[PDB]
Amino acid sequence: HLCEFIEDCEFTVLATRILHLLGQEGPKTNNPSKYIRFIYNRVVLEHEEVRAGAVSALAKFGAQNEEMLPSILVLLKRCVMDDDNEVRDRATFYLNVLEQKQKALNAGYILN
Amino acid sequence: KEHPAHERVLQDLVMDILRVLSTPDLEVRKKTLQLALDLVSSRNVEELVIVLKKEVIKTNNVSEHEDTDKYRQLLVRTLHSCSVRFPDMAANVIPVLMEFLSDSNEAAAADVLEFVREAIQRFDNLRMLIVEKMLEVFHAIKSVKIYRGALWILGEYCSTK
């Protein structure tokens, strides 16, 4: 309900809060395809900023992986990628950051 | 124009004609600009450029742009193209300056466009000055646009360690 409605019940501000929370929660509650499905959408919206949250939430999530995620988790960041300079940069950088640590290690430091 | 035997001169006479444009009507003007761009094998250029600069001054003036603004953007496009081909010069520096003066996004977008481009183009030298120029501009200024500007530039970085 939240997901859907909020989508078409708007307000960016809400998203900030919820994002943050969601950010922690991920794969302890599974339903991956859906959740992904959502996540993509959330990003769908413009705003470098709106887009950005899906990646950040993801870090706790990614790290944990779910009912299918690690392989693919690795595949995805690749599949979804962006320019728009500082938006480019965000993709690049997260990557670059990613680039910079053994992704397993990477996850551990950053997450905390 | 498909008199592709296309004589030198003719291209050249344009400016004269173009002068008339100062008695505006953008829409007409606009048609001109496209038209204009074409002839230049990166030449009859300077005289023009100069003239452009004249335009530029003219553009300053006191203005109450409403139509001409548009023109400016266009001009810049028209202008942009040339440069690609050309080796260009001080004139260009001036845009940079000019741009600093200005206050609306579309230009920033162009600028940015330039950011991109230039990032590709790198013969560099100019940039550095400009970067300096910019440094001034920057010091000299505040805004989201700027704020954004900083970001990329910052991103870019080099010397004066």
Closest CA to B110 of B71, B57, B73, B135: B73
Structure token pair of residue B38:
């074409």
A78: distance to nearest CA of chain B, Å? 22
Structure token pair of residue B13:
């006479």
Check: CB of residue B45 under 8 Å from CB of residue B79: no
- Report d(CA A87, CA B148) in Å as an integer: 11
- Report d(CA B56, CA B63) in Å as an integer: 12
Check: CB of residue B72 under 8 Å from CB of residue B104: no
Long-range contacts of B136-145 (CB under 8 A, 24+ apart): B137/B97, B137/B100, B140/B100, B141/B100, B143/B103, B145/B105, B145/B108
B147 in contact with A at a CB cutoff of 8 Å? no
Q: How far are the Cα atoms of A54, B67, B68, B78 from residue B59, in angstroms, in the given order?
A: 46, 12, 8, 16
Structure token pair of residue A54:
């899906």
CB within 8 Å: A86 and B152: yes
Closest CA to B41 of B4, B94, B75: B4
Check: CB of residue A51 under 8 Å from CB of residue A81: no
- Report d(CA B132, CA B113) in Å as an integer: 19
Give the experimental resolution in Å.
10.1
Check: CB of residue A103 under 8 Å from CB of residue A71: no
Query: Within its chain, how far is the Cα of A43 from the centroid?
Result: 8
What's the DSSP call for residue B20?
Answer: G
Q: Which amino acid is at A4?
A: E
**Helices A103-111 and A86-100, axial angle in degrees (round to 10):** 110
Residue B155 with chain A: CB contacts under 8 Å: 85-86, 89
CB within 8 Å: B115 and A85: yes
Residue B115 with chain A: CB contacts under 8 Å: 85
Structure token pair of residue B146:
């700027």
Query: Got the DSSP string for A66-101?
Result: -SSHHHHHHHHHHHS---STHHHHHHHHHHHHHHHS
Question: Phi/psi class of residue B40: alpha, beta or left (left: φ > 0; alpha: ψ in -120 to 50)?
Answer: beta
Query: Got the DSSP string for A7-70?
Result: TTT--HHHHHHHHHHHHHHGGGS--HHHHHHHHHHHHHSS-HHHHHHHHHHHHHHHHH--SSHH
- Report d(CA A109, CA B2) in Å as an integer: 66
Q: Which residues contact B39 (CB under 8 A, 6 or more apart)?
A: B6, B10, B11, B12, B14
Check: CB of residue A69 under 8 Å from CB of residue A27: yes
Q: Which of residues 93-132 of B touch A (CB under 8 A)?
A: 112, 115-116
- Report d(CA B152, CA B121) in Å as an integer: 16
Structure token pair of residue B160:
């004066």
Residue B151 with chain A: CB contacts under 8 Å: 86
Task: State which approach was used to obtain the coordinates.
Answer: cryo-EM
